[PDB]
Design a binder for this molecule. Structure first.
Ligand SMILES: [Ca+2]
Ligand SMILES: [Ca+2]
Ligand SMILES: [Ca+2]
Ligand SMILES: [Ca+2]
Ligand SMILES: [Ca+2]
Ligand SMILES: [Ca+2]
Ligand SMILES: [Ca+2]
Ligand SMILES: [Ca+2]
Length: 148
């Protein structure tokens, strides 16, 4: 990446993509990728394979869906980070696992983990979108508690 707004597209191998400053778009493609949004409002999509997603500071967006495998988000900060999951809300299973939040797509091996979600506010993503539903932090908590 560069200080500008970049679009960084991986290939089928395990890739490291670093957006640097600016509002970037990072798409890993297949393989196990490491994606960094760094400073700015970035959109990170690991795609297939098991990807580590570091949106960095700023308000970052993370994509997930069927066939995305097991991806882990490591947030650093931002008051309006978001996850956008391409599935119906009733296909989602929310659980606490230690200090992580784990979101599974029912009927699949696809799972999205937010590392240290329960440690502190800077590790949280503030809105989780399913197809036509935006779930805020109080809503996420209620799903976790209900599905325990
Ligand atoms: Ca950036
Ligand atoms: Ca950049
Ligand atoms: Ca890749
Ligand atoms: Ca990938
Ligand atoms: Ca960022
Ligand atoms: Ca962020
Ligand atoms: Ca993935
Ligand atoms: Ca946040």
């Amino acid at each position: 990446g560069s200080a500008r707004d970049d679009v960084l597209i991986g290939d089928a191998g395990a890739n490291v993509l670093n957006g640097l400053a600016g509002n970037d778009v990072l798409s890993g493609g297949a393989g196990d990728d490491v994606l960094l949004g760094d400073e700015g409002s970035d959109l990170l999509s690991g795609d297939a394979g098991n990807d580590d997603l570091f949106g960095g500071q700023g308000d970052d967006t993370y994509l997930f869906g069927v066939g995305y495998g097991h991806d882990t988000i490591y947030e650093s900060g931002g008051g309006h980070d978001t996850i956008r999951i391409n599935a119906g809300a009733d296909q989602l299973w929310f659980a606490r696992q230690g200090n992580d939040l784990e979101i599974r797509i029912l009927g699949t091996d696809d799972a999205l983990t937010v590392h240290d979600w329960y440690r502190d506010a800077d590790h949280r993503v503030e809105i989780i979108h399913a197809a036509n539903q935006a779930v805020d932090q109080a809503g996420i908590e209620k799903l976790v508690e209900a599905m325990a």
